[PDB]
Symmetry: C3
Subunit: 317 residues, 3 copies
Amino acid sequence: PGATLCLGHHAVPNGTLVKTITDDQIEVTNATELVQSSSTGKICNNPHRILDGIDCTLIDALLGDPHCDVFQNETWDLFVERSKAFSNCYPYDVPDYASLRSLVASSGTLEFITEGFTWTGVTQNGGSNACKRGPGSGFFSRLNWLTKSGSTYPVLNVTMPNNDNFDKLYIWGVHHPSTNQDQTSLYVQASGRVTVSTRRSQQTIIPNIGSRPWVRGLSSRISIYWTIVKPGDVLVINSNGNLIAPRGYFKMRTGKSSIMRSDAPIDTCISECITPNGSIPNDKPFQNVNKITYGACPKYVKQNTLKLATGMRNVPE
Amino acid sequence: PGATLCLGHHAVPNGTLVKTITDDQIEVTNATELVQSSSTGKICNNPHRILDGIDCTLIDALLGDPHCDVFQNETWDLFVERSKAFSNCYPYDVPDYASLRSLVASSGTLEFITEGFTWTGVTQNGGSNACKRGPGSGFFSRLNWLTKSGSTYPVLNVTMPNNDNFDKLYIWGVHHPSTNQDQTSLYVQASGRVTVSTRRSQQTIIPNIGSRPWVRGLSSRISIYWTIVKPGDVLVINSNGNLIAPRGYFKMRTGKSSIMRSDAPIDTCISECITPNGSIPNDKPFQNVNKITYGACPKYVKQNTLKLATGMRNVPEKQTR
Amino acid sequence: PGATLCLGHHAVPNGTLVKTITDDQIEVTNATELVQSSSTGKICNNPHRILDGIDCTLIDALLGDPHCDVFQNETWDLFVERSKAFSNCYPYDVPDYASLRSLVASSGTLEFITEGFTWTGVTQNGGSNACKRGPGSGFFSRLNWLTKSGSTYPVLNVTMPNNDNFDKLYIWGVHHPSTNQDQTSLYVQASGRVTVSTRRSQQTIIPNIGSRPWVRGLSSRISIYWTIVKPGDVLVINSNGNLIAPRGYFKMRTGKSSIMRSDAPIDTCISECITPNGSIPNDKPFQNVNKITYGACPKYVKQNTLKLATGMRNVPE
Ligand SMILES: *[C@@H]1O[C@H](CO)[C@@H](O[C@@H]2O[C@H](CO)[C@@H](O[C@@H]3O[C@H](CO[C@H]4O[C@H](CO)[C@@H](O)[C@H](O)[C@@H]4O)[C@@H](O)[C@H](O[C@H]4O[C@H](CO)[C@@H](O)[C@H](O)[C@@H]4O)[C@@H]3O)[C@H](O)[C@H]2NC(C)=O)[C@H](O)[C@H]1NC(C)=O
Ligand SMILES: *[C@@H]1O[C@H](CO)[C@@H](O[C@@H]2O[C@H](CO)[C@@H](O[C@@H]3O[C@H](CO[C@H]4O[C@H](CO)[C@@H](O)[C@H](O)[C@@H]4O)[C@@H](O)[C@H](O[C@H]4O[C@H](CO)[C@@H](O)[C@H](O)[C@@H]4O)[C@@H]3O)[C@H](O)[C@H]2NC(C)=O)[C@H](O)[C@H]1NC(C)=O
Ligand SMILES: CC(=O)N[C@@H]1[C@@H](O)[C@H](O[C@@H]2O[C@H](CO[C@]3(C(=O)O)C[C@H](O)[C@@H](NC(C)=O)[C@H]([C@H](O)[C@H](O)CO)O3)[C@H](O)[C@H](O)[C@H]2O)[C@@H](CO)O[C@H]1O
Ligand SMILES: CC(=O)N[C@@H]1[C@@H](O)[C@H](O[C@@H]2O[C@H](CO[C@]3(C(=O)O)C[C@H](O)[C@@H](NC(C)=O)[C@H]([C@H](O)[C@H](O)CO)O3)[C@H](O)[C@H](O)[C@H]2O)[C@@H](CO)O[C@H]1O
Ligand SMILES: *[C@@H]1O[C@H](CO)[C@@H](O[C@@H]2O[C@H](CO)[C@@H](O[C@@H]3O[C@H](CO)[C@@H](O)[C@H](O)[C@@H]3O)[C@H](O)[C@H]2NC(C)=O)[C@H](O)[C@H]1NC(C)=O
Ligand SMILES: *[C@@H]1O[C@H](CO)[C@@H](O[C@@H]2O[C@H](CO)[C@@H](O[C@@H]3O[C@H](CO)[C@@H](O)[C@H](O)[C@@H]3O)[C@H](O)[C@H]2NC(C)=O)[C@H](O)[C@H]1NC(C)=O
Ligand SMILES: CC(=O)N[C@H]1[C@H]([C@H](O)[C@H](O)CO)O[C@@](OC[C@H]2O[C@@H](O)[C@H](O)[C@@H](O)[C@H]2O)(C(=O)O)C[C@@H]1O
Ligand SMILES: *[C@@H]1O[C@H](CO)[C@@H](O[C@@H]2O[C@H](CO)[C@@H](O)[C@H](O)[C@H]2NC(C)=O)[C@H](O)[C@H]1NC(C)=O
Ligand SMILES: *[C@@H]1O[C@H](CO)[C@@H](O[C@@H]2O[C@H](CO)[C@@H](O)[C@H](O)[C@H]2NC(C)=O)[C@H](O)[C@H]1NC(C)=O
Ligand SMILES: *[C@@H]1O[C@H](CO)[C@@H](O[C@@H]2O[C@H](CO)[C@@H](O)[C@H](O)[C@H]2NC(C)=O)[C@H](O)[C@H]1NC(C)=O
Ligand SMILES: *[C@@H]1O[C@H](CO)[C@@H](O)[C@H](O)[C@H]1NC(C)=O
Ligand SMILES: *[C@@H]1O[C@H](CO)[C@@H](O)[C@H](O)[C@H]1NC(C)=O
Ligand SMILES: *[C@@H]1O[C@H](CO)[C@@H](O)[C@H](O)[C@H]1NC(C)=O
Ligand SMILES: *[C@@H]1O[C@H](CO)[C@@H](O)[C@H](O)[C@H]1NC(C)=O
């Protein structure tokens, strides 16, 4: 009178399909998802310092558009620019806008240090009704619009050495008048010139008189440029007209800072990974939410699902 | 007297060598090639719309070099530029030629819409014997060479708003005269200026008088620039001399369009994948024909062969010879 | 009284840890290192031709800064630029410095061929005490500083066709005077212009008068430009002032040549792979020494060690 001893394994009534070397679909007892495909829709305000630009681009906060004055000296790990942002100061362009935005974003600070530039024989603090600050005309807070004093605008020739142990970022510009009358009325000379240099490098910009499209009452424009001055080097600014002068420099840093375009609201929560769609968990190695990310994130892939088998082959009965 | 039952497997007289984790070469019963290494030498005319440039670069077709007039308003999935292409109009350069070529190639169309620009106090439709159109002097079809009327060239100041819901591409230029006599003779003012702007952006170009190498009779040149005007924005052109004016705009699109340099002839066949060497099949995952491709193509690799084993190890009977 | 026959395998007392699919660390009898993590600290002078720049950047050797005259017509597989290099001639900048440095580095030669440019009505061979040669003033050896003859500087208009079967590299420049007095004193015309062209392309540079920081006595500058002329094409140079003229061309090659920034000393040894830290062996497939390499090198990875198991699982007694 014997006995039977059967060896076996478990099964489940409803298995999951996975891919292998030999099968595009085969059933196993269990699997887990490796692609993060959803977001909360919200950017968590920890553990990264999130700075909401609201109505302001980083560049407008940098220049000091009056409605962006609240951003003076701000810092961030991630600056968030909104699609509703608008400019409301002198109409301007930045040749290589993208590079200036990038280098400031990456620096992570708008810390500004005022310097005592001496502008001999010119009028300082020019403004416009296109850039109101309170009820009266105004200007970008970090820039100093120089014009004639009496009936002359002399050749400006000034210096600022960098005797600190950090890099200085200087933002400056050039005014493009609408007419010859505007040019001579403001700067006396019929044609201006701005040359900004360090020991190693230089930029010279010739203004261009003429009409651009009307923006906030003006066919004139300002063009924005930048110059980095390293320790031991020196800034020199040289102009006989049309200079939009720096008031000082921005302190530069290196680190983890960046910038992102997103309309996702900011919320009080914790998430290492941020996308423009909102924060996403980072327990999974891959994600299909957005190729734009910031922080400790799963890697972006095209697949919306990939199943890692966590059990044996499911052979039901 | 019992019986013997032997288990076994097949072998074949002619195996193939494959690579594994442990072996650089080991013999299996069969294998299949994963690298496409040959082409027909011909570009198949389907399923993609292939436009043969023949004697014309895309840029010459865009500007409207007379021998390229047949390309007016053309469209393509793949524009094919030939090594025999030549220019035969006013000598010109395009700063950032590569970008203009790229953005037009990618747009996939030369559809041109003429606009009623008003050029007050200048002579229109200037031409050159370097750019013959029929028996007489001519010019790029899409550009309008403005010069003095009587003894004056006034400050030109014109606008064109974009009230459409698509982007407009404007092509314009600046004429560089050979001498001061040429400059004043054509434009009166001793030095010209072209400023083209939108709300957001602006380009100002100062012409430069002097000799460049003689091309079709001329040491002068034209430089070509472009400006995209989005819906709701406006073009403004401002000049007191040397303007080579747009006659209108090109309609821009987005899609699958591109451009390829190839001398391969175009033939009647069907192939998703195109290389400069000709079309190639796409049944294999890899290819070693050319890193330049267009369409549904195998991925370019350096190996000219890679064998995927499709059978077991091939073990012939121990050899008595 | 029968017998026992035990099958077994070897072990060692002290095994090595490797990583697998299932284990972060598991012990095997032996393994071999796949990441090269050390260097000698020295650059081997074979089998690649190493040219030590010493006190000279490649660009200064190219222009012919006097202390770099020893590099005239030199060749290299790898030009090594040292952090102690300095400039000691007219102060200058190169817009797109990085591209000029790259294309020269890649050409692998400073072979210079003098051409008989005819400069009618100007004074040739201008120099400066910022660029001393012998007891007197001097200049970049490969450039010809043109100034007025008598009371005129005429429109210069010269041509040079390329009837060779190689590309010609022309280096030229533009002088930026410190003052209007300097400009008219040297060139007569109040504003200069340099136009350098080939059949298909052209560059025009307007000089900019004004002060830059003092370097070796000077607030003036030279800006350096280049033009490649292919076989069958032709150079034209046209100027009414401020031209720093080429004396000829550099003969261009294509091949394996490059440039590296390193302070590692050069030694007599053999190594295919060079990093800025020094030469490294290339018996391993990966390396963690430096992402900058030249020659037959292991691929750069972030891991400092990766162990390929060369034996079975170690199960000691
Ligand atoms: C600034 O300096 C330059 C260089 O000296 C001058 O440019 C030259 O000017 C002359 C005169 O216009 C040009 O001569 C013409 O050459 C043509 C042949 O061209 C081919 O070969 C040359 C090489 O020698 C290539 O440059 C060119 O690309 C072609 O491959 C001839 O076809 C012309 O002949 C016709 O015109 C002349 C009248 O000028 C008649 O005698 C003939 O019968 C015929 O009708 C002509 O000989 C020369 O090509 C120019 N060279 C270059 C490199 O550009 C500028 O003119 C000068 N500027 C000023 C203001 O002085
Ligand atoms: C536009 O504005 C600028 C700024 O004022 C002017 O440029 C300055 O010009 C002055 C006078 O020409 C320059 O002065 C010279 O500086 C030399 C180097 O200075 C640097 O290095 C020394 C150490 O070697 C440091 O101590 C110093 O901080 C600097 O970093 C000096 O070596 C020169 O010395 C000579 O003169 C002095 C007289 O005071 C004597 O004691 C010496 O023995 C010697 O003879 C001299 O002082 C100055 O460097 C310029 N600065 C800059 C930033 O460029 C322009 O001149 C002006 N433009 C116009 C058109 O006017
Ligand atoms: C200084 C002054 O009041 N000048 C009178 C001009 O206002 C006037 O021209 C017109 O200007 C209008 C906008 O003007 C401002 C502005 O931007 O708000 C006024 C600013 O004070 C002035 N700032 C400075 C430093 O001068 C500024 C500046 O000149 C321009 O922005 C430079 O491009 O102009 C508006 O554009 C009107 O359409 C226009 O008529 C002139 C001519 O009427 O008279 C001046 O007395
Ligand atoms: C209008 C005219 O006929 N002017 C005479 C010039 O032809 C002549 O200069 C000669 O020009 C030759 C080539 O000339 C054209 C051309 O490009 O084909 C003729 C065109 O009609 C003219 N177009 C316009 C709108 O003016 C064009 C233009 O001026 C230049 O291309 C601009 O740079 O020139 C060739 O270059 C000869 O070498 C040259 O002598 C002058 C001087 O002799 O006399 C004029 O009567
Ligand atoms: C060159 O031509 C352009 C285009 O015609 C001129 O620009 C236009 O200038 C006028 C005023 O001179 C602008 O009109 C203004 O519009 C506002 C509302 O938008 C209105 O409230 C004002 O009363 C005023 O009429 C017009 O917008 C502007 N056009 C564009 C496209 O910007 C330019 O002034 C001409 N310049 C010269 C010197 O001829
Ligand atoms: C062992 O592997 C080889 C491939 O390395 C096999 O030969 C290939 O077989 C395929 C599919 O059976 C053949 O495709 C056919 O080609 C004809 C035209 O030639 C076409 O009309 C059919 O519709 C079909 O696509 C292919 O020709 C052939 N390729 C080569 C390079 O030989 C072989 O069949 C395998 N043998 C065994 C015994 O498994
Ligand atoms: C070809 C030539 O003119 N060489 C001059 C040179 C140039 O005029 C100058 O570099 C152009 O910018 O100037 C040299 O002078 C330097 C010296 O000039 C004095 O006038 C002034 O007192 C000083 O401040 C200083 O600039 C030079 O060495 O560069 C002389 C040279 O012969
Ligand atoms: C995250 O946001 C991106 C960017 O808007 C979304 O991508 C868009 O969504 C659909 C297809 O998914 C398209 O109609 C758009 O053209 C896409 N734009 C881009 C730039 O890719 C994405 O779907 C969002 N993902 C999640 C999970 O919310
Ligand atoms: C496809 O064309 C490429 C490019 O023309 C061929 O590779 C070139 O072959 C030339 C000589 O014929 C060599 O000197 C170069 O090494 C190659 N050029 C480049 C740019 O890589 C290639 O062999 C062709 N392939 C086939 C299958 O025809
Ligand atoms: C080779 O040289 C590089 C560059 O000088 C060394 O990298 C530095 O070392 C540590 C990381 O190990 C960092 O803190 C530094 O910031 C690194 N510098 C840079 C520029 O990355 C590297 O360690 C050297 N390696 C060896 C083996 O000598
Ligand atoms: C699948 O994954 C884990 C087990 O590691 C667990 O969360 C879940 O209950 C499992 N499901 C099934 C059906 O086994
Ligand atoms: C910016 O930086 C410092 C504060 O640490 C100071 O110099 C300056 O007053 C600050 N400005 C503002 C507006 O906070
Ligand atoms: C190009 O297209 C437009 C409208 O789509 C048309 O008005 C124009 O005449 C066309 N030109 C040619 C040459 O077909
Ligand atoms: C360990 O493996 C390497 C590579 O095969 C070999 O050179 C070395 O001698 C081996 N050492 C031992 C102790 O087996």
